[PDB]
């Protein structure tokens, strides 16, 4: 038999490892482990880009298998467009909440 | 705070800075050694009156330029600065191990100094072949100090290689595949794989040399059934990958510089350029015995090494042609960095083609251990690596410093250097064809004219180097702060400003999957 | 049989650039033969070809070192 | 394929403990016996000062410079022969 | 030997070296063409205000950039490997001569018939006779019969050396415990010079090779006189 | 033995600004000082030994 | 925590250009001089 | 505050102390080989052991105690350890190359045969076969230890790991005894050179691997490992399998084929 | 690239001093050793 005696992650994981384990249980990704899936990227359905500040760098892979990534600062305010493909992105700032 | 920041660093940018400083200092040592070489040869007869000292100078020149100038600047300096910025990573995978790779180099350099200062130095050539490097022809501490210098440099670069591979594989944005990383990041990844596989074989070989010298082993000593040629196989099994290690990060930088100053969003034929660097890395492991065509090699072996060596020209040509295809249709900015890159393309090509001449074992019988080989590698390696470094340095100095160079001064520096290196090395082809041996302190009288001109060339490059130091001084003295950089949409390393904050990408980039 | 001996001919056993084993084999063949013709009272003249071939190919210092080691009882080949 | 038992198919740990005590440690016990039975000191061979053996190009950095690190006087001669 | 302001190889003394000269001319023409094409294309990419900065398809041009270089390499490899296998083909020498490398002089052994050996040292500059060549002359030259296939066996009694004669297309490393074989055939009488070609320490620059190629009958009398 | 990991987690997550190499307390500071003294003293002795080995001694 | 921005992300001061000229002179000059002084050392012990 | 999963490490002195320990050990070996003194070498070994102790202590503090090893950080450590093992394989490859070069073309100085004239190789069926059984057995026990850990079984993890360490120690003592008993030495030409340097580096790796397993034993005693999170144990097991495989190549190449 | 005007402009005279001192830091020590080579040999 197993006499047990080995702790589990549920019992002993701490710090950022624990925060990642508990957010993954709720299907949430505060530490950006997963690639976000694109919307249609129109003015009416822009890609929603979370941030803990008022700006965030976006890289846009305009077409599948493009080797060139298009990089730009997305600012809080009106949706901005990728300078290569015109796809729409909108910042959604938020306090670093629990 | 100073000690915590500069001695206890876990920051990729500050460690990159330490590498560039180290490499620049090492570059001055290597340069002084080169000028002593060309002073000994600058007129017929003896200058030093001591050919053991000449041989120590030649040996030290090579070790300093390869291990303390080129590799630290390209992999340590540009690698640490640029690779995390180009993939959106907050640091290297092993930020603390990163600091030990740096701090192993000053003691590595001290061991090599010590070797030159103790006894009569290590006058072996950078190949350190036994039995000349053995305990009868080189009794005393000098060769052992050289071996230990290489051990410390080997550990530095192996841990550096583990760090880069891990960083580039593990720390990209989750949507970015390897086929969305910039060519410079590929060039560092492939370089790191060659280091990981090649340096341990060098470490085994020189450890066997150390035991032959100190523990009465006879790996390389015929009296015990050993063989000097075994040493040569182990050395060059490392040594050929080493020459691709020295150029690959330069190929990466040249792809970025030509793309940038051509006003293009991307290099021509990205996947072709990835293929070419991987093909060069792979072929670089199966060609080593072209360094050994005169040791008494069977004809079938010579035929194989001739053929495998030549096919390296195919992937390399794809890169040269793709660089030209990148220029094609460009809005060309004639920046100093672009001049270094265009010089690189031409001079690398001349040196590559003399390589193809040497690959032919039948011609190599007559050209081996002559100044033709010296001409070959000062074109591909000395000019190629130095031109890529100077291009990189000029291009990215405002990113690292936050300050601009005077472009006019930078173009003057390029012109002087271009003249100096060509005057120095081009005539060495004539010396080689006409049969002047390498590793000579003096030459028959017929070789005087080309040696005189080559030594005059070396002084022109000296003037370029002194001018480079002043130009860096002028930038730090004037403090013209950078405002705006073009093409940030395809050059992520500039997007955090100049210089970037201590911590970048604390919040990662957003990249989705369409 | 083969007089007007000029030098050691091509030997298909040793066709490459390293001729160390050619020298060694002919040295062993001479001294084995020479041993066998004392042990059987016979005549050393039969061994002559091997003597000529090893004298042609072998460095003097190698022949001389091997001769010293046979006399000392430290020669590592089987004669 | 000099190895024939059915794939044991319970707890992983239970199977590997079974292999540890049922195959691995028995093999070590057996090889330990075989080594015990071929263990006795064999006759040391006649000394010949072969020039390819007992190499000394430099004195060792310990003792008198002439003894190897794990020098065994019963079976390791010096360049001049066995020690009395 | 080399002459002042020489650009190319020493004139060929052997038929193998003549083969190498024609192979070098062929290879050098390809090197000059490729380097000048690359320089020209650079100048061409840089001398127009016309622009095309959108994505360019690479597939078609990469075929040309791969197949053409491949053909060029084959056009070098074919004659290269012909000369290589030509060099290696069975020669039947008339004579065997050994050279032993030393720090810093060559020894020669001619032991086909009699025990002839001698040491060959550089003439110091202070002792040269008028018109003699600094760093090239030796006290005792390597006398050899002309127009005959000779087997040279090369080894060393100390460190590595290398035994070279550029005008005969010869370079063979001198490795202790190893006996390397090369073949030598001079089309011409004369003096043919070479220099140690593997770094062997402080006097590497100062242990030259001088071959003296003469009719067999002079070679035979010289040999008998050197016993 | 007993699982005391929760105690160590509390000690090492204490919001006291100390780097991880000093965060265990006074013993860290002593082992740090001994390591750095041996390294810097040993390095000074290696430089002395270089100085010595760089010149002949009859 | 650490100083940020131009002239602060370096282990040497650029606060005064003449002090910087002295530091750069000693740094690069010490590198370039060293092999000359090692050759001198090797010539003198002989 | 970061919103990535990667570890920003506190500024550390251990890289500098490690680099300086490399200078003291190498200049120390130089002083030992040439100037008849062990002083620098003993300082070097001492600072090296202090550096490794404090560095790996801090990694345990960062992971077990502070929670910095997210899955992304753990995946990086996996790559690092595999790449490290690859570099060690290529190190050993150099020694196998030297052995095959020497043994396939035995020179006249050896008698033109392998083993050389005057060499009496060990019987591969005696202690070398025992050494083989011991390291193979230790690969089975460490696998038992790994499965016990993943199934949450503290006592059986500790028993299996103890058995693994004991076999490591047994191999080391068997090899030290073989070294003492061997009638050839490292000075016995290329046979002794290839034998002792190749098995000697392997022996060093066994001692390092055993030390690593002993660290894991003490970390298991103090409950550091979870049933799902224990990279240090996995790394030690990969390294231990590496040591086992290198032994099998030595045994087949040097002891068996080269006898 | 665009930049601000220099915070601490370096005049032509200041550049002549920077260049002169840079060149002398390379030339004088090496010059001194190379001038005294003959003295070193007699030791
Ligand atoms: C070329 C690299 C960069 C530029 C370098 C600039 C500096 C050099 C100038 C620029 C010189 C132009 C290049 C051609 C060499 C001229 C000598 C020659 O006729 O060479 C002849 C051959 C051998 O031929 C023979 O066996 C016959 C000898 C004929 C005897 C006549 C004697 C009279 C000679 C008078 C002296 C003149 C020598 C010039 C002496 C020059 C001293 C510096 O030599 C050889 O094999 C040497 C070949 C070396 C291999 C290097 C790779 C070549 C690619 C570089 C070219 C770039 C293309 C763009 C070309 C444009 C680039 C500017
Ligand atoms: C309590 C404090 C005391 C702490 C103890 C230290 C003292 C601190 C002072 C006092 C602290 C208080 C704050 C004052 C700030 C510094 C003042 C200064 O100007 O102080 C000067 C500092 C800094 O100096 C250096 O580091 C050397 C460089 C000097 C000028 C270089 C300019 C070159 C620019 C061009 C390069 C382009 C590349 C960059 C391009 C990128 C730019 C972003 O001096 C030193 O005391 C440095 C001590 C070691 C630091 C690590 C340096 C890395 C080594 C470099 C490789 C050497 C190769 C030898 C190899 C050896 C082998 C033999
Ligand atoms: C990267 C490698 C490299 C570099 C750059 C150089 C640079 C130079 N080298 Fe050489 N050299 C070798 C590698 C290199 N070398 C090797 C491997 C050997 C063989 C040794 C042996 O046989 O064992 C050799 C041998 C060699 C010989 C043959 C000696 C002989 O056979 O006896 C000669 C002769 O002229 C020579 C000359 C020169 C000169 C004049 C320069 C330079 O003066 C020319 C270009 C000038 C520079 C001044 C470089 C400046 C760069 C910097 C200062 C960095 C700045 C840093 C930043 C901006 C961050 N070198
Ligand atoms: C940057 C460093 C570097 C690089 C990249 C190279 C690249 C190559 N090198 Fe060289 N080499 C050295 C550094 C380098 N080398 C050093 C340091 C030595 C001497 C070491 C010593 O002894 O100390 C040496 C020695 C050396 C020798 C041994 C010579 C001897 O000692 O006798 C040989 C033999 O084949 C060789 C071959 C080549 C070839 C074939 C390439 C190929 O990779 C080059 C391919 C490139 C091109 C061909 C140009 C671009 C291509 C095109 C434009 C396409 C069209 C071209 C054709 C169809 C031909 N090199
Ligand atoms: C120098 C070399 C170094 C080598 C190191 C030394 C190794 C030898 C021993 C080491 C320590 C072993 C002690 C055994 C203690 C066990 C305590 C844990 C037991 C436990 O709690 O687990 C139970 C095991 O019980 C059971 O049968 C018991 C399970 C079996 C345990 C003991 C088995 C005996 C092993 C002997 C080894 C053989 C070697 C050859 C010697 C032959 C001599 C006879 C669970 O039972 P279950 O799976 O539900 O069903 C069992 C019924 N079949
Ligand atoms: C189970 C084995 C026990 C562990 C080992 C115990 C003690 C010291 C050994 C250190 C481990 C290093 C291994 C490799 C080095 C050399 C060979 C050592 C192998 C060995 O121990 O071999 C002994 C010789 O040791 C000798 O000479 C010398 C002994 C020590 C000299 C120190 C050598 C230092 C070499 C530095 C190597 C640096 C390279 C590292 C690469 C790093 C990557 C860059 C053999 O004894 P013997 O009397 O000849 O013959 C037996 C006759 N009865
Ligand atoms: C040792 C051996 C030496 C080897 C050297 C040999 C080199 C061979 C080179 C041959 C190249 C021939 C191809 C011609 C390309 C020229 C560049 C260019 O600009 O080509 C364009 C083609 O690009 C398009 O469209 C389609 C998009 C992709 C265009 C692809 C252009 C390829 C560019 C290659 C340039 C190579 C330069 C240097 C080579 C070393 C022309 O645009 P157009 O408006 O006419 O067409 C579009 C028309 N619409 C839009 C109205 C429909
Ligand atoms: C002849 C005498 C020459 C002597 C030269 C000796 C040189 C230096 C001696 C000092 C070395 C001792 C110090 C211990 C170093 C431990 C490195 C380590 O363990 O590095 C780890 C990464 O490498 C990994 O995993 C996997 C890689 C682990 C590497 C282990 C250390 C190896 C040291 C020697 C390597 C030799 C190279 C191989 C060729 C033989 C951790 O990376 P850090 O960035 O720290 O932290 C990351 C944090 O997230 C952890 O929480
Ligand atoms: C002559 C003197 C020479 C040297 C002698 C002795 C040398 C070394 C002693 C042996 C090495 C001991 C290594 C101890 C490492 C302990 C730290 C550790 O194992 O750290 C782990 C990370 O792994 C990691 O860094 C992985 C780090 C792995 C390090 C790899 C070690 C191999 C180094 C060997 C050096 C070889 C040199 C060979 C000579 C050529 C921590 O993560 P977990 O375990 O998941 O814990 C977290 C959970 O608790 C959360 O729930
Ligand atoms: C000779 C040296 C020793 C070889 C070492 C091999 C290294 C293996 C590392 C641990 O991995 C496990 O090993 C077995 C893979 O073959 C499997 O065992 C177990 O897997 C099942 C479930 O765990 C059980 O039902 C089985 O009975 C049991 O064999 C299991 O899948 C696998 O994860
Ligand atoms: C904080 C770390 C800094 C520590 C600095 C330590 C400095 C210690 C310096 C003195 O030690 C020297 O080293 C050698 C070894 O101790 C001695 O030589 C000796 O070496 C041999 C072996 O011990 C003797 O047998 C020789 O006779 C003898 O010259 C020498 O005399 C002794 O002065
Ligand atoms: C490859 C590197 C290139 C180096 C090229 C160096 C160019 C020369 C720089 C000048 O260096 C100085 O030259 C003086 C001579 O012009 C030397 O003075 C020497 O000669 C003077 C006049 O003969 C005496 O007044 C001095 O006292 C005596 O030291 C002086 O020592 C040396 O610093
Ligand atoms: C003390 C502890 C029981 C309490 C606990 O789990 O903390 C037990 C569990 C496993 C035990 C160990 C294992 O059974 C393996 C070893 C067995 C040996 O016979 C004694 C030492 C030995 C190393 C044991 C020491 C001690 O009895 C341990 C460590
Ligand atoms: Cu003999 Cu060079
Ligand atoms: Cu090569
Ligand atoms: Mg050579
Ligand atoms: Na000279
Ligand atoms: Zn887009």
Listed by start position, the domains of chain F span 1-58
B156 is catalytic: yes
List the CATH number of the domain containing B49.
Answer: 1.20.210.10
CA distances from B60 to B64, B384, H186 (A): 6, 20, 32
Task: Give distance in angstroms: CA of D20 to centre of ligand 5.
Answer: 9
Mutual angle of helices H71-104 and B228-261, in 10-degree steps = 140
**How big is the B-H interface in CB pairs under 8 Å?**
212
Asked if the C-beta of I31 comes within 8 angstroms of chain B's C-beta atoms, the answer is no
Q: How many domains does chain A have?
A: 1
Residue E127, sorted as left (phi over 0), alpha (psi -120 to 50) or beta, turns out to be: alpha
- Give the atom of ligand 13 at the shortest distance from the alpha carbon of H163: 15
B438 is catalytic: yes
- Locate tokens 């960083």: which residue? B167
**H109 and H222 together in one domain:** yes
**Residues in chain H closer than 8 A to B505 (CB atoms):** 4
D58·B225 Cβ contact <8 A: no
B129 is catalytic: no
Among H68, H92, H123, the domain boundary falls at H68
CA distance B284 to B279: 8
Return the residue whose CA atom lies nearest to atom 16 of ligand 9: H56
CA distances from E51 to B255, B263, B330, E40, E56 (A): 19, 10, 6, 19, 12
Provide the edge-to-edge strand list for the sheet that holds A55-60. Answer: A70-75, A55-60, B510-511
Residues flagged as binding site of B for Na(+)? 40, 45, 441
Asked if the C-beta of I42 comes within 8 angstroms of chain B's C-beta atoms, the answer is no
Q: Is B292 exposed, middle or buried (0-12, 13-18, 19+ CB in 10 A)?
A: buried
**Residues in chain F closer than 8 A to A12 (CB atoms):** 3, 5-6
CA distances from E67 to B245, B315, B317, B465, E73 (A): 27, 11, 11, 42, 10
B443 is catalytic: no
Task: Give distance in angstroms: CA of B119 to centre of ligand 11.
Answer: 21
Judge whether D16 and H143 are in contact, CB under 8 Å. yes
Partner residue opposite E27 with nearest CB, options B134, B263, B360: B360
Which sequence spans correspond to the domains of chain E?
Answer: 2-91, 92-227
Residues of the domain holding C31: 1-79
Beta partners for residue F45, in sequence order: none
CA distance B122 to E76: 40
B61 is catalytic: yes
- Give the atom of ligand 2 at the shortest distance from the alpha carbon of B401: 43
Asked if the C-beta of C77 comes within 8 angstroms of chain H's C-beta atoms, the answer is yes
A88-93 vs A80-81, strand pairing mode: antiparallel
Task: Give distance in angstroms: CA of E43 to centre of ligand 7.
Answer: 17
Concatenating the DSSP letter of every residue in G2-39 gives ---STTTSSSS--SSHHHHHHHHHHHHHHHHHHHHHHH
CA distance to partner chain H, nearest, from residue F28 (Å): 9
Closest CA to H101 of H187, H186, H184, H198: H198
G2·B56 Cβ contact <8 A: no
CA distance G29 to G34: 8
Residues of the domain holding A1: 1-98
Q: How many domains does chain H have?
A: 2
Partner residue opposite H123 with nearest CB, options D16, D20, D38: D38
CA distances from A52 to A94, B12, H97, H190 (A): 5, 24, 57, 66
- Locate tokens 């193979």: which residue? H136
**H83 and H52 together in one domain:** no
Is the CB of residue G13 below 6 angstroms from any atom belonging to ligand 2?
yes
CA distances from B253 to B79, B256, B259, B350 (A): 10, 5, 10, 19
B319 is catalytic: yes
**Residues in chain A closer than 8 A to B180 (CB atoms):** 61, 66-67, 69
Touch test F–D: 3 Cβ pairs or more under 8 Å: no
Partner residue opposite F13 with nearest CB, options A7, A12, A15: A15
Catalytic position from the list B244, B261, B288, B379: B244
Read off φ and ψ for residue E101, nearest 5 degrees: -70, 140
Task: Say which CATH topology domain E92-227 has.
Answer: Immunoglobulin-like (2.60.40)
Judge whether E155 and E176 are in contact, CB under 8 Å. yes
Task: Say which CATH topology domain E2-91 has.
Answer: Helix Hairpins (1.10.287)
Is the CB of residue B128 below 6 angstroms from any atom belonging to ligand 3?
no
CA distance B133 to B111: 16
The answer to whether the annotation marks A85 as part of a ligand binding site is yes
Which of the other chains make 3 or more beta carbon contacts under 8 angstroms with chain C? B, D, E, H
3-state SS, B85-144, equals HHHCCCCCCCHHHHHHHHHCHHHHHHHHHHHHHCCCCCCCCCCCCCCCCCCCCCCCCHHH
Which residues, 6+ apart, have CB-to-CB distance to E9 below 8 Å?
A: B366, B433, B434, E17, E20, E21, E24, E166
**H25 and H153 together in one domain:** no
CA distance to partner chain A, nearest, from residue F8 (Å): 11
Is the CB of residue H136 below 6 angstroms from any atom belonging to ligand 10?
yes
Which of the other chains make 3 or more beta carbon contacts under 8 angstroms with chain E? B, C
Determine the longest span between alpha carbons in chain B, in angstroms: 72
CA B71 to chain centre: 5
Q: Which residue of E has its CA nearest to B442?
A: E205
Asked if the C-beta of B279 comes within 8 angstroms of chain E's C-beta atoms, the answer is no
Residues of the domain holding B106: 2-514
**How big is the A-F interface in CB pairs under 8 Å?**
8
Triad F3, F7, F8: Cα angle to 5°: 95
B256 is catalytic: no
The answer to whether the annotation marks A68 as part of a ligand binding site is no
């Amino acid at each position: 038999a197993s006499g047990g005696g080995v702790p589990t992650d549920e019992e002993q994981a701490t710090g950022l490892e624990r925060e990642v384990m508990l957010a993954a249980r709720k299907g949430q990704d505060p530490y950006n482990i997963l690639a976000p899936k694109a919307t249609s990227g129109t003015k009416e359905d822009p890609n929603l880009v979370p941030s803990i500040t008022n700006k965030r760098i976006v890289g846009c892979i305009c077409e599948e298998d493009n080797s060139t990534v298009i990089w730009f600062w997305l600012h809080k305010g009106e949706a901005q467009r990728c300078p290569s493909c015109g796809t729409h992105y909108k910042l959604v700032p938020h306090q670093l909440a629990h | 705070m100073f000690i915590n920041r500069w001695l206890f660093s876990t920051n990729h940018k500050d460690i990159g800075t330490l590498y560039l400083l180290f490499g620049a200092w090492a570059g001055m040592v290597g340069t002084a050694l080169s000028l002593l070489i060309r002073a000994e040869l600058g007129q017929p007869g003896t200058l030093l009156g001591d050919d053991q000292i000449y041989n120590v100078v030649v040996t030290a020149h090579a070790f300093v330029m390869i291990f303390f100038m080129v590799m630290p600047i390209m992999i340590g300096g540009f690698g640490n600065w640029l690779v995390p910025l180009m993939i959106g990573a907050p640091d290297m995978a092993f930020p603390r191990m990163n600091n030990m790779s740096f701090w192993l180099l000053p003691p590595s350099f001290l061991l090599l100094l010590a070797s030159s200062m103790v006894e009569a130095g290590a006058g072996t050539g950078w190949t350190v072949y036994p039995p000349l490097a053995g305990n009868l022809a080189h009794a005393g501490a000098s060769v052992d100090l050289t071996i230990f210098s290489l051990h410390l440099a080997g550990v530095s670069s192996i841990l550096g290689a583990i760090n880069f591979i891990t960083t580039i594989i593990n720390m990209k944005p989750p949507a970015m595949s390897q086929y969305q990383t910039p060519l410079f990041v590929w060039s560092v990844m492939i370089t790191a794989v060659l280091l990981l596989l090649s340096l341990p074989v060098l470490a085994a070989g020189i450890t066997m040399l150390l035991t032959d010298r100190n523990l009465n082993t006879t790996f390389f000593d015929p009296a015990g059934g050993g063989d000097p040629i075994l040493y040569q196989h182990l050395f060059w099994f490392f040594g050929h990958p080493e020459v691709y290690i020295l150029i690959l990060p330069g190929f990466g930088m040249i792809s970025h510089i030509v793309t940038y100053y051509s006003g293009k969003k991307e290099p021509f034929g990205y996947m072709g350029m990835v293929w070419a660097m991987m093909s060069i890395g792979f072929l670089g492991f199966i060609v080593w015995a072209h360094h050994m065509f005169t040791v008494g090699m069977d004809v079938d072996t010579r035929a194989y090494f001739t053929s495998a060596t030549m096919i390296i020209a195919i992937p390399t040509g794809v890169k040269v042609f793709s660089w030209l295809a990148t220029l094609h249709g460009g809005n060309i900015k004639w920046s100093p960095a672009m001049m270094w890159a265009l010089g690189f393309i031409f001079l690398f090509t001349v040196g590559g083609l003399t390589g193809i001449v040497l690959a032919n074992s039948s011609l190599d019988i007559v050209l081996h251990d002559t100044y033709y080989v010296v001409a070959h590698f000062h074109y591909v390696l000395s000019m190629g690596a130095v031109f890529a470094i100077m291009g990189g340095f000029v291009h990215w100095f405002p990113l690292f410093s936050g300050y601009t160079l005077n472009d006019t001064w930078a173009k003057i520096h390029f012109a002087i250097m271009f003249v100096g290196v060509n005057m120095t090395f081009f005539p060495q082809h004539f010396l080689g064809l006409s049969g002047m041996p390498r590793r000579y302190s003096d030459y028959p009288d017929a070789y005087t004219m080309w040696n005189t001109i080559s030594s005059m060339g070396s002084f022109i490059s000296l003037t370029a180097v002194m001018l480079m130091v002043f130009i860096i001084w002028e930038a730090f003295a004037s403090k013209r702060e950078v405002l705006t950089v073009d093409l940030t949409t395809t050059n992520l390393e500039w997007l955090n400003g100049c210089p970037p904050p201590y911590h970048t990408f604390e919040e990662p980039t957003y990249v989705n999957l369409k | 049989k083969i007089k007007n001996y000029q030098t050691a001919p091509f030997d298909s056993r040793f066709p490459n650039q390293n001729q160390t084993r050619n020298c060694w084999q002919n040295y062993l063949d001479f001294h084995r033969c020479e041993k066998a013709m004392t042990a059987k009272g016979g005549d050393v003249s039969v061994c002559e070809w091997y003597r000529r071939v090893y004298k042609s190919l072998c460095p003097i210092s190698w022949v001389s070192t091997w001769d010293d080691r046979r006399a000392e009882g430290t020669f590592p080949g089987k004669i | 394929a000099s190895a024939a038992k059915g794939d044991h198919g319970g707890t992983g740990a239970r199977t590997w403990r079974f292999l540890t005590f049922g195959l691995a440690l028995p093999s070590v016990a057996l090889c330990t016996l075989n080594s015990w039975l071929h263990s006795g000191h064999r006759e040391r061979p006649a000394f010949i000062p072969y020039h390819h053996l007992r190499i000394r190009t430099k004195p060792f950095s310990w003792g008198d410079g002439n003894h190897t690190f794990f020098h065994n006087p019963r079976v390791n001669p010096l360049p001049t022969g066995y020690e009395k | 030997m080399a002459y002042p302001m020489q650009l190319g190889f020493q004139d060929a003394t052997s038929p193998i070296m003549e083969e190498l000269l024609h192979f070098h001319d062929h290879t050098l023409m390809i090197v000059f063409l490729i380097s000048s094409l690359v320089l020209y294309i650079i100048s061409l990419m840089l001398t127009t205000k016309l622009t095309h900065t959108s994505t360019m398809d690479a597939q078609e041009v990469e075929t040309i950039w791969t197949i053409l270089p491949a053909i060029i390499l084959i056009l070098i490899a074919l004659p290269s490997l012909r000369i290589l296998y030509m060099m290696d083909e069975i020669n039947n020498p008339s004579l065997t001569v050994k050279t032993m490398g030393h720090q810093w002089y060559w020894s020669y052994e001619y032991t086909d018939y009699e025990d002839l050996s001698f040491d060959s040292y550089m003439i110091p500059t202070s002792e040269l006779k008028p018109g003699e060549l600094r760093l090239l002359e030796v006290d005792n030259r390597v006398v050899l019969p002309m127009e005959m296939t000779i087997r040279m066996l090369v080894s060393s009694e100390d460190v590595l050396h290398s035994w070279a004669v550029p005008s005969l297309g010869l370079k063979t490393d001198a490795i202790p415990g190893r006996l390397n074989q090369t073949t030598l055939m001079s089309s011409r009488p004369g003096l043919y010079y070479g220099q140690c070609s593997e770094i062997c320490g402080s006097n590497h620059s100062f242990m030259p090779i001088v071959l003296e190629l003469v009719p067999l009958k002079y070679f035979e009398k010289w040999s008998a006189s050197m016993l | 033995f007993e699982n005391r990991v929760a105690e160590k987690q509390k000690l090492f997550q204490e919001d006291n600004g100390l780097p991880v190499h000093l965060k265990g307390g006074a013993t860290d500071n002593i082992l740090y000082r001994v390591t750095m003294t041996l390294c810097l003293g040993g390095t000074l002795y290696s430089l002395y030994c270089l100085g010595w080995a760089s010149f002949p001694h009859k | 925590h650490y100083e940020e921005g131009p002239g602060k992300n370096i282990p040497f001061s650029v606060e005064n250009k003449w002090r910087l000229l002295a530091m750069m002179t000693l740094f690069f000059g010490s590198g370039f001089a060293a092999p000359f002084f090692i050759v001198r050392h090797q010539l003198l012990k002989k | 505050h970061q919103t990535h999963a990667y570890h920003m490490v506190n500024p550390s002195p251990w890289p500098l102390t490690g680099a300086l320990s490399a200078l003291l050990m190498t200049s120390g070996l130089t002083m030992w080989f040439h100037f008849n003194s062990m002083t620098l070498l003993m300082i070097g070994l001492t600072t090296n052991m202090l550096t490794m102790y404090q560095w790996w202590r801090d990694v345990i503090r960062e992971s077990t105690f502070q929670g910095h090893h997210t899955p992304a950080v753990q995946k990086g450590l996996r790559y690092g350890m595999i790449l490290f093992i690859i570099s060690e394989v290529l190190f050993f490859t150099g020694f196998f190359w030297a052995f095959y070069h020497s043994s396939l073309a035995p020179t006249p100085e050896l008698g033109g045969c392998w083993p050389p004239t005057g060499i009496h190789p060990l019987n591969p069926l005696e202690v070398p076969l025992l050494n083989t059984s011991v390291l193979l057995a230790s690969g089975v026990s460490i696998t038992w230890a790994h499965h016990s850990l993943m199934e949450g079984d503290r006592k059986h993890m500790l028993q299996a790991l103890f058995i693994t360490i004991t076999l490591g120690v047994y191999f080391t003592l068997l090899q030290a005894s073989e070294y003492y008993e061997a009638p050839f030495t490292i000075s016995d030409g290329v046979y002794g050179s290839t034998f002792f340097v190749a098995t000697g580096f392997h022996g060093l790796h066994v001692i390092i691997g055993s030390t690593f397993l002993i660290v894991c034993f003490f970390r298991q005693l103090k409950f550091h490992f979870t049933s799902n999170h224990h990279f240090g144990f996995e790394a030690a097991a990969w390294y231990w399998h590496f040591v086992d495989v290198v032994w099998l190549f030595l045994y087949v190449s040097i002891y068996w084929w080269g006898s | 690239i665009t930049a601000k005007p220099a915070k601490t402009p370096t005049s032509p005279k200041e550049q002549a001093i920077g260049l002169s001192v840079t060149f002398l830091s390379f030339l004088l020590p090496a010059g001194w050793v190379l001038y005294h080579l003959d003295n070193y040999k007699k030791s």
